[PDB]
Write a protein that binds this ligand. Structure first.
Ligand code: 2VD
Ligand code: 2VD
Ligand code: CA
Ligand code: CA
Ligand code: CL
Ligand code: CL
Lengths: 359, 360
């Protein structure tokens, strides 16, 4: 196995396949075949593969090398460096300028593969749309809940919409985006680590994303990268049951102003329970907080509200999470009563919605 | 006690006094003779910041939680007016339609440092003190049992001020002339105190006044006064570890040398970090290997005319020096494989670094 490639063509591929990395799981599989260098990283649950065209002379073969060390070596070389690689006995030699390195290898035959599987559902969409869908909801996934199905994100196809749902039992985020293709009605759960990796592969360019879903796997092709993950078992909740049936009390306020006020009130909220109370009245919102030391905060804001007066408590962190996710001018809070969830949205888009349980 | 002040006139003061019993998590606030004073302490050191009060005020003193008070003021909007008044056991804070009631502890209970007399004094520019500390800070020990190493030596001699730091393995020294006749004296400043001193300096046009006592040090700059205890101990003599008449001077661009060392370091022993240098006519070869028998080699052009030699060093210590230097070219002053190396900015002898030889 031999290849010579410019540093600039290896960096991002190495970054992508090595980021999240059986000592052999700490290695990258390298394969030179048919004028292509393939780089693969896996943790047995998911896999990233990068392809890199080889325009200079090369020789076929495969090996595995320590991912972090190989990446750090390549990153450490100067801009414009050309990196010559060749296998020599048990070691992989890496040469650039008068910098030389000899890395240990493990046999390519030992590198684990995911099970083969069939694609049942496919569609393509812009990168910017997948980014939007993931960023809108990702913060609301559970982290290590014993309900394993919540440690991850729902990807649902319906009509021509792709929808993501994330919830941890206390708060929920949902976002739907049209993708201009007839889709079957289908849902899968992607594990939270796979969601993060998928997000990280979205470079910001105009390369479209191709998605393939099987019964136990999801795959995403973007540019010269292929990401594959297993799915999570279990019955995900139905976001329509979490959305308030009829939250017909509508409050509108500046996002930044609202966030600032909550963030200040939070300072004097209970350090564990983070409770704040909201008093809504005609064109006015009052937020209060207090803690076991009897310290107290009060914020009063102008808002647009024409409904009945009411009072409700929330965990302020959950609300701040939403407002930070929104990135918009004005927010709409949609209320039911003092003992029911609240729905929050961008006042100028219903494309994402957030639900927070009351305290 | 009452005052009203612009948010932006409190932020810097609040940053500075938060730097140093639960009253130690409070700040002492005092309104007197046109001035708000804020004090934070950890009983070892203390910072006092003064804010001029141009709006109506009323005298008095209290203490409030530092983190919460600082967070409220920082969270308030740009340009906000902050009105504070003491209401019984609470301190009330208001600005626009935001109101806060904070718990207080009596000012009477706020601890003072022991009184002391100044014995050595001098004034220098902030940039000079900043250079002195930054040049050497990284070589101070952290929680070493030799408590006298967990800090920095400040030494006055003639018209110069010198700092020394060492952890028992490597050493940094920096000396700057400060244009005033000083007694020959030295003290050890605790590492936490060094960091706080460093951070009180903005590099601006206010002169820094330093006062040293038997057991304390104080630094006054503009509206801020820092006071710390000294470390009551004996510091090692830096002159003892400086190599005698090193006659083999290697010179190279700092960044090229640094990047070579950083790449080589990847395949060095994770715990002991040894790398080898082979010096020859205008050439440096650096090698590294690890227990798994992986190997790195770097060859660079340098300026070097001395006898050929080999020497090993801890690459983390060498990289620490190169990162602190932030200069164009470096000088490595070599002697032989069993002697230390002295490293300097090629264009300046004001800072010097000593690293020990490793056998491999
Ligand atoms: O009992 C539930 C019901 N539930 C649930 C979810 C959810 C989402 C929102 Br925004 C509000 C309530 C939700 C989503 C996850 C559902 C599940 O267990 O599969 C249960 N959640 C509690 C928290 C809770 C307790 C009492 C009242 C409301 C919420 C929990 O997950 O620990
Ligand atoms: O004193 C020491 C250990 N030591 C010590 C210090 C020191 C600083 C540097 Br840059 C390098 C070595 C240091 C400073 C702290 C000394 C102490 O224990 O108080 C020990 N070693 C000498 C050997 C030696 C001689 C000359 C120069 C360096 C080291 C010995 O054990 O006799
Ligand atoms: Ca705006
Ligand atoms: Ca929606
Ligand atoms: Cl270099
Ligand atoms: Cl070596």
């Amino acid at each position: 196995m031999k290849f010579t490639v410019e540093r600039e063509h290896l960096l991002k591929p190495l970054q992508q396949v090595s980021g999240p990395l059986l000592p052999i799981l700490g290695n990258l599989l390298l394969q030179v075949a048919d004028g292509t260098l393939s780089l693969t990283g896996t943790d047995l649950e998911m896999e990233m593969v990068a392809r890199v065209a080889l325009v200079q002379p090369h020789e076929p073969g495969a090996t595995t090398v320590p991912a972090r060390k190989f990446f750090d070596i390549c990153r450490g070389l100067p801009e414009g460096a050309e990196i010559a690689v060749q296998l020599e006995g048990e070691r992989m030699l890496v040469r650039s300028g008068r910098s030389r390195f000899s890395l240990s290898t493990l046999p390519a035959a030992d590198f684990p593969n995911l099970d083969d599987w069939q694609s049942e559902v496919e569609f393509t969409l812009p990168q910017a749309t997948m980014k939007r869908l993931i960023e809108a909801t990702q913060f609301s996934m559970a982290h290590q809940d014993v309900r394993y199905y919540l440690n991850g994100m729902l990807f649902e196809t319906e009509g021509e919409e792709l929808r993501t749902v994330a919830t941890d039992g206390h708060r929920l985020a949902v976002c739907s985006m049209p993708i201009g293709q007839s889709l079957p009605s289908h849902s899968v759960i992607v594990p939270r680590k796979g969601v993060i990796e998928l997000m990280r592969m979205l470079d910001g360019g105009d390369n479209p994303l191709r998605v393939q879903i099987g019964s136990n796997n999801i795959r995403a092709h973007v540019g010269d990268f292929i990401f594959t993950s297993k799915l999570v078992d279990g019955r995900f909740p139905d976001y329509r049951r979490v959305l308030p049936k009829n939250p017909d009390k509508h409050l509108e306020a500046g996002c930044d102003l609202l966030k600032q006020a909550f963030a200040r009130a939070a300072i004097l909220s209970n350090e564990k329970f983070r409770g704040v109370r909201l008093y809504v009245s005609e064109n006015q919102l009052k937020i209060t907080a207090n803690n076991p030391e009897q310290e107290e905060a009060e914020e009063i804001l102008d808002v647009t509200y024409s409904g009945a007066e009411m009072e409700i408590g929330f965990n302020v962190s959950y609300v701040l999470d939403v407002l930070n996710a929104l990135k918009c001018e004005n927010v709409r809070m949609m209320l039911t009563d003092s003992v029911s969830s609240v729905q929050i949205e961008d006042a100028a888009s219903q494309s994402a919605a957030y639900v927070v349980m009351p305290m």
